[PDB]
Amino acid sequence: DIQYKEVFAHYEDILEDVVNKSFGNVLEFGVGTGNLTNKLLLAGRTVYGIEPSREMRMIAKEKLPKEFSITEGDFLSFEVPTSIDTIVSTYAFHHLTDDEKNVAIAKYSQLLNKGGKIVFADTIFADQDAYDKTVEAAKQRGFHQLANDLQTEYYTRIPVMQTIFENNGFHVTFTRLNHFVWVMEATKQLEHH
């Protein structure tokens, strides 16, 4: 894992940052092994989990308190908890093509109330140059699995994500927490219905 040493740099701080920007009922996508949830629960937040992988939902049910709800849905198809104030996820949104990312945001815009937020932490790039330069660096070093990841998954650019959020009624702010990851804080501008 020397290859992902930088990708996960400040991992904890990253979850911390997402936690500190969330309130009320939290809907988490891509629960994985429950690391984000864990800090979300510690922070006294009310959380509802979503994770397609049964393999993952298990490990999380293991670490998290019992009773914790975690359905088998995903970013686009999932159970709506009830009243959502903020939607979160870390290291997951890139599993969606840019078109799907737009459907997702369009859908969260439809569910959240004025003032509702979307806080996602994920690997994303400033521009095409920053990306190609990162893919090369990974090649430069012996990082072959990482270079594959970068050209396989659907990582995108900050400006693209910028347009999607705003096109769907959001005002978003980007804060870099490491060379790969950035935290995007989005707040819904207008009210529902």
UniProtKB/Swiss-Prot annotation:
UniProt keyword terms in alphabetical order: Methyltransferase, S-adenosyl-L-methionine, Transferase
Keyword RNA-binding: no
Top-rank lineage group of the source organism: Bacteria
Residues where S-adenosyl-L-methionine binds: G30, E51, D74
Single GO MF annotation: S-adenosylmethionine-dependent methyltransferase activity
Cleaved signal peptide residues: none
Any matching Pfam family: Methyltransf_25
Cysteine disulfide links: none
The keyword Methyltransferase belongs to this UniProt entry's keyword annotation: yes
Similarity section: Belongs to the methyltransferase superfamily. YrrT family.
Function: Could be a S-adenosyl-L-methionine-dependent methyltransferase.
The protein, known as: Uncharacterized methyltransferase BT9727_4108
Lineage: Bacteria, Bacillati, Bacillota, Bacilli, Bacillales
